[PDB]
Amino acid sequence: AMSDTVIERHADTAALVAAAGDRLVDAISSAIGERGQATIVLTGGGTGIGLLKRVRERSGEIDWSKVHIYWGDERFVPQDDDERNDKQAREALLDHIGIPPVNVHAMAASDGEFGDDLEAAAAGYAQLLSADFDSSVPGFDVHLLGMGGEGHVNSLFPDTDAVRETERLVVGVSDSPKPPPRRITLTLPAVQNSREVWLVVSGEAKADAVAAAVGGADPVDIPAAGAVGRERTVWLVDEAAAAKL
Numbered sequence: 001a002m003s004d005t006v007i008e009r010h011a012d013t014a015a016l017v018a019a020a021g022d023r024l025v026d027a028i029s030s031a032i033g034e035r036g037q038a039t040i041v042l043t044g045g046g047t048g049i050g051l052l053k054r055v056r057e058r059s060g061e062i063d064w065s066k067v068h069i070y071w072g073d074e075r076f077v078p079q080d081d082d083e084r085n086d087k088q089a090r091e092a093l094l095d096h097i098g099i100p101p102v103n104v105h106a107m108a109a110s111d112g113e114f115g116d117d118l119e120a121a122a123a124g125y126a127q128l129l130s131a132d133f134d135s136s137v138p139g140f141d142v143h144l145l146g147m148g149g150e151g152h153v154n155s156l157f158p159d160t161d162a163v164r165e166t167e168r169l170v171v172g173v174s175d176s177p178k179p180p181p182r183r184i185t186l187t188l189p190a191v192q193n194s195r196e197v198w199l200v201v202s203g204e205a206k207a208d209a210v211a212a213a214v215g216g217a218d219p220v221d222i223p224a225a226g227a228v229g230r231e232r233t234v235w236l237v238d239e240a241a242a243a244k245l
Contacts, residue, residue, distance in 0.1 A: 010236070010238055013047065016238045017200075024040070028040065028141075028142075037066045039140045041142070042069060042070070042085070043072050044088060046202075048144055051144075052092035056092065064100075068105070069103060070132075071105075072144070072191070074183065075183055076172070077110055077180050084109065122185075129190060142195070143186075145198065145200070146199070146201070147213070153223050154185040154191070156188065165187040168187060169187060192229075195230055196231055199227060199236070202238040203240050204241070210242065214235060
């Protein structure tokens with residue numbers, strides 16, 4: 001394989017989040033400088049939203065009209081619920097930058113376009129991605145991910161039909177073991193069509209999964225092991241999360 005694994009360690013969470021944010025600003029500018037646009041997939045969770053606040057601090061460096069935004073997963077709950085990933089991203093960053101709404105592609109909410117139809121909502125997002133993957137090869141420039149201690153990424157949990165999905169780009173998860181139970185999630189084939197996949201991971205509880213995933217486990221057991229970019233996979237980790245490497 002010619003897809004390299006990059007591990008960048010920082011001393012703690014604050015240092016990690018600041019560094020990941022800076023890296024993302026530089027990545028967006030490079031993509032724009034090389035191809036005239038950038039396509040980024042956002043994630044939820046503490047570190048994933050935290051790095052967006054750092055991006056905001058440097059937002060003036062980027063022409064946001066050339067940036068296209070997707071999400072790797074979303075809680076299928078009402079639009080204004082605090083559990084929404086898109087809502088947190090908007091407050092951290094998106095509400096504060098001049099990015100055209102047609103460039104920002106949030107997954108549906110349960111009081112949204114599709115009503116409470118989780119399956120229909122995931123299918124709608126999958127049709128959206130299909131247009132993407134046919135204009136741009138590969139699809140995304142950077143897919144950001146958080147990872148849980150059991151190795152889950154997006155809403156792909158161990159042993160599930162979602163992590164086993166080899167065809168559909170997006171599926172509904174109606175039974176997440178972490179609340180809330182209903183999520184919309186990109187599958188591994190979608191994650192894998194990114195130039196780079198970046199997992200930003202902090203804490204001692206994540207150390208076993210980091211080591212298993214870097215070491216190349218079966219993704220059905222450790223979903224993060226299948227979260228690999230076409231050009232590189234970048235682990236932005238703190239020292240605690242790196243302790244089993």
